[PDB]
Amino acid sequence: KDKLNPPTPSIYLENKRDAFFPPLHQFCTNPKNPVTVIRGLAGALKLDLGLFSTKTLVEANNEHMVEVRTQLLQPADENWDPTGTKKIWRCESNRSHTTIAKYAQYQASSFQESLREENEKGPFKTIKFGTNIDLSDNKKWKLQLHELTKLPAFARVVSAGNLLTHVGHTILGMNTVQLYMKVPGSRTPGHQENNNFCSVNINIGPGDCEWFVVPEDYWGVLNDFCEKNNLNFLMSSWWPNLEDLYEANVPVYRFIQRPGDLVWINAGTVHWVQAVGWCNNIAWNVGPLTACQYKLAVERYEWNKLKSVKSPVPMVHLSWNMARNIKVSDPKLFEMIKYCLLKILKQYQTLREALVAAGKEVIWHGRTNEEPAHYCSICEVEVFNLLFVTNESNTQKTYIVHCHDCARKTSKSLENFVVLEQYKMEDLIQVYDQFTLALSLS
Ligand SMILES: CCN(/C=C/N(C)C)C(=O)CNCc1cc(C(=O)O)ccn1
Ligand SMILES: [Fe+2]
Numbered sequence: 001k002d003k004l005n006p007p008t009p010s011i012y013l014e015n016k017r018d019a020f021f022p023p024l025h026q027f028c029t030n031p032k033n034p035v036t037v038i039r040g041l042a043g044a045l046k047l048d049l050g051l052f053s054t055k056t057l058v059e060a061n062n063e064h065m066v067e068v069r070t071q072l073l074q075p076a077d078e079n080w081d082p083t084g085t086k087k088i089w090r091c092e093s094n095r096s097h098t099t100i101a102k103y104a105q106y107q108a109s110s111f112q113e114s115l116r117e118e119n120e121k122g123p124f125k126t127i128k129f130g131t132n133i134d135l136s137d138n139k140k141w142k143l144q145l146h147e148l149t150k151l152p153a154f155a156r157v158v159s160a161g162n163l164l165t166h167v168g169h170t171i172l173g174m175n176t177v178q179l180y181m182k183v184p185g186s187r188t189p190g191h192q193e194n195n196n197f198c199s200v201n202i203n204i205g206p207g208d209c210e211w212f213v214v215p216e217d218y219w220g221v222l223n224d225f226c227e228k229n230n231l232n233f234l235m236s237s238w239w240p241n242l243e244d245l246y247e248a249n250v251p252v253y254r255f256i257q258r259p260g261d262l263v264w265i266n267a268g269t270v271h272w273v274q275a276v277g278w279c280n281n282i283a284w285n286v287g288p289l290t291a292c293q294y295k296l297a298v299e300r301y302e303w304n305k306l307k308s309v310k311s312p313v314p315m316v317h318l319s320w321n322m323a324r325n326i327k328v329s330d331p332k333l334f335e336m337i338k339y340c341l342l343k344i345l346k347q348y349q350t351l352r353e354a355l356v357a358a359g360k361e362v363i364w365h366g367r368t369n370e371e372p373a374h375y376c377s378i379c380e381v382e383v384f385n386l387l388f389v390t391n392e393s394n395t396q397k398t399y400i401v402h403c404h405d406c407a408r409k410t411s412k413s414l415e416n417f418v419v420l421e422q423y424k425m426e427d428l429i430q431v432y433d434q435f436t437l438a439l440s441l442s
């Protein structure tokens, strides 16, 4: 049915007014729109995409690291086993590193070679995709990062309405810019964003990308398929067979992103992308202040625990920063945050009383401002407030963090550990008590 091939939510921008019009940010963050393509965005804002051209990038930081994916050049929207006899979900990708200068040479010679060839069931050729290029350093990428502050607030890397701004520290590639350098067939395989955060992607050009999108609420179907085909949904490289998805009554949005078009991926939307031509892309994440964003981020945070996968977003730390610093006026989002804080508080009280009842000392350790959230050095779970550190690491002042469970597993009565406390209970209770719903009339 055509309900399985829905139209792409699209906004067509002409000028700065259209870009700054409030209904645009509302349309993007509406859960009903799994993806929004904001066409003509760069043109409307007079954004200089030339600052992200391969020539410019080479001049700026020619030795900068590029992660290379070596992949097969597959036809159209398909993925075939290498023998070319059946379509399969697993895709072949080898990883290596290079520099912006070397990948640039390849990107150009790739184009020259296609010109020559034009003047003339696989097996398939190999291509290289330059991915995950880290544009976090403002000293190396001043002009590039400055250009992006011309976006409307809701889409910027940094803004008051962005939950990632409220984390209070860098999360690489989420609240810092990533760049991609591509040749035709460069594939970003199927995924959801880290902790289901929204994402922004702008195509620099000169060529096009083709996007495939499934709504968040079908992510389970794709997780199922993955397991049925011996794949880790979160961690393997897979490229959905569209025939399988259609048979499964999964709607698939598909569109072309042209140079200067911004793609807004909504919370939890499943997606995969390929370069149609030669192009670069830039991307980052944004966390709008909505009930839907927070709910989905919390859910994936908890799912990640079950799957033994680290959450790049420390949702406990973030939740406390929202309560300390953000007046929240949406009643549904308020109740979610308030609920989470209460769970955190009651688990922390239960653990801290257990320690005290067992006669284990709790050491006042405190905290530096802007100090990042801590994760367990063994299981990578976020650890809040009570840090378990070995006697030795404490002595050395390396303060290597374990969670309670990992510490107990090593050291049955915690005899090898000290317990460090970063926050007074009375102070957390106060932050919770004073976190109340603000009135907004809109
Ligand atoms: C799988 C989560 N992740 C980060 C992992 N890296 C930090 C390794 C992402 O960056 C997800 N977004 C990648 C992406 C890249 C493109 C692209 O190739 O343009 C389009 C859409 N999405
Ligand atoms: Fe993505």
Ligand SMILES: [Zn+2]
Pocket: 376, 377, 378, 379, 380, 381, 402, 403, 404, 405, 406, 407
């Ligand atoms: Zn642990």
